[PDB]
Copies of this chain bind each other. A is one copy, B any other.
Amino acid sequence: MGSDTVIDEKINIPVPLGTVFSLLYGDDTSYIKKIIENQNNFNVCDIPKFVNNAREITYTKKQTKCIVTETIEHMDLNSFFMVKQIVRSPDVPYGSSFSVHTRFFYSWGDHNTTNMKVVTNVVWTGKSMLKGTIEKGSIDGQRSSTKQLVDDLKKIISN
């Protein structure tokens, strides 16, 4: 529980990265609108064009409302792009306390195709004081280590 599931890492779409990007994330949102409707969703709202590498999509699942954010995390149509999707269900039990995170890896595949990997986990929020104390120590310690790592890394390369 809480760990990642590799939903699938043996996906290949037989067209280049830029085509898969255009279909799923491009300026013509008709393709992704239908795809969403084919997954037993309806009343999909007008798909915003990407702005600041993000867009928010609302629809109804078969019944409950879903709010989905998609964030482009890396964008190299010659080699690799990566999108993180976060799906919220505000009206289900504890829906304000969890979301479903899915990262989509799109990487150059043999013969100019697109390899796809899909990884998901469920992220719980909700601020238990005990959890909150442990998290603050964990994040403060990682901030300290990361600053030391970057400092040492730069000293290593400078000689």
C-alpha gap A127/B108 in the complex (Å)? 37
* B142 and A102 form a contact (CB under 8 A): yes
Q: Which residue of chain B is the closest to A151 with respect to CB atoms?
A: B38
| Selected A-B contacts with CB under 8 Å, 17 pairs | A1-B125, A1-B127, A2-B125, A3-B123, A7-B142, A13-B157, A14-B154, A38-B148, A38-B152, A73-B119, A74-B82, A74-B105, A76-B108, A80-B82, A100-B141, A120-B138, A122-B131
C-alpha gap A135/B100 in the complex (Å)? 9
Q: Is residue A24 within 8 Å, beta carbon to beta carbon, of the partner chain?
A: yes
A interface, CB within 8 angstroms of B = 1-5, 7-8, 11, 13-15, 19-20, 23-24, 31, 34-35, 38-39, 73-74, 76, 78-80, 82, 94, 98, 100, 102, 105, 107-108, 116, 118-128, 130-132, 134-135, 138-139, 141-150, 152-154, 156-157
C-alpha gap A116/B124 in the complex (Å)? 26
Which residues of B sit under 8 angstroms from A79, Cβ to Cβ? Answer: 74, 76, 78-80
A interface SS class:
mixed
* A156 and B120 form a contact (CB under 8 A): no
Q: Chain B's nearest CB lies how many Å from the CB of A116? A: 7
C-alpha gap A3/B22 in the complex (Å)? 28
